[PDB]
């Protein structure tokens, strides 16, 4: 199991501005992948989902094109 990449204090914050950051965690299909593969916080993942899905509603990530 790999590390909680976000969860350093040196690491970047959590938000929805980072379209590249959210793309890096959303697959090419456009779905949310699993913690079992991503290896980050369960909490961090909660934040990631909130940010990515805010971006989706603001039309920043494809809706299964």
Partner RNA sequence: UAAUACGUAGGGUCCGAGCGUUGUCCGGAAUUACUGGGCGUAAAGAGCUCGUAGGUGGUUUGUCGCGUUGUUCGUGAAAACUCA
Partner RNA sequence: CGCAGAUAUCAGGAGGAACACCGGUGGCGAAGGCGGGUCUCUGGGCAGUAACUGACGCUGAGGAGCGAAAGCGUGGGGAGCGAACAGGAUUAGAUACCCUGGUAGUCCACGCCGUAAACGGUGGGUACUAGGUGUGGGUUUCCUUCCUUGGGAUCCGUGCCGUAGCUAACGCAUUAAGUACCCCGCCUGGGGAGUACGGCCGCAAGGCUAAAACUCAAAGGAAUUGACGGGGGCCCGCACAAGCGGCGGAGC
Binding site for Mg ion (CB under 5 A): 47
- 3-state class (DSSP) for residue 26: strand
* By the rule CB under 7 A, 2 interacts with RNA: no
Toward RNA, which CB reaches closer, 20 or 42?
42
- Least separation in angstroms between CB 21 and RNA: 15
Matching residue, tokens 């350093």: 8
Matching residue, tokens 């909490």: 43
Pair 29, 63: CB distance under 8 Å: no
Tell me which residues in 22-51 interact with RNA (CB under 7 A). 31-35, 41-43, 45-46, 48-50
Toward RNA, which CB reaches closer, 2 or 20?
2
Q: Which of 45, 41, 28 is closest to 1 using CA atoms?
A: 41
């Amino acid at each position: 199991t790999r590390k909680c990449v976000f969860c350093s204090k040196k690491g970047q914050t959590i938000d929805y501005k980072d379209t590249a950051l959210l793309r890096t965690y959303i697959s090419e299909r456009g779905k949310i992948r699993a913690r079992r593969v991503t290896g980050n916080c369960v909490q961090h993942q909660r934040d990631i989902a909130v940010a990515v899905k805010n971006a989706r509603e603001v039309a920043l990530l494809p809706f299964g094109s």
